[PDB]
Amino acid sequence: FSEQVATQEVIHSENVIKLSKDLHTTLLTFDKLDDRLTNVTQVVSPLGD
């Protein structure tokens, strides 16, 4: 009964909810990733230069 459905509630609801929130924050992290990569290779033009 609602112990198992409580695992559906907390696990499914919190898993979906913090899955979207943590994965969207991870998308902001990937925004910082390509940010630092773009500034990185853009600073690495003097390497080939």
Partner: protein
């Protein structure tokens, strides 16, 4: 643990069923062996059980 719950009631149910089956057969053999000084439904019900 909801699948250990459902698994526990699942295999508990199936083993309860097979336990009921062997309980029935050994119960019938007890009904056979109980009959002393009758010798008439002995071969009838006993040979029905061994079938």
């Amino acid at each position: 643990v909801n699948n250990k719950k459902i698994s526990l009631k699942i295999s508990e149910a199936t083993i309860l069923i097979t336990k009921v089956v062997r309980i029935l057969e050994l119960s019938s053999k007890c009904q056979e062996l109980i009959t002393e000084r009758k010798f008439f439904k002995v071969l009838q019900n006993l040979d029905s059980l061994e079938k």
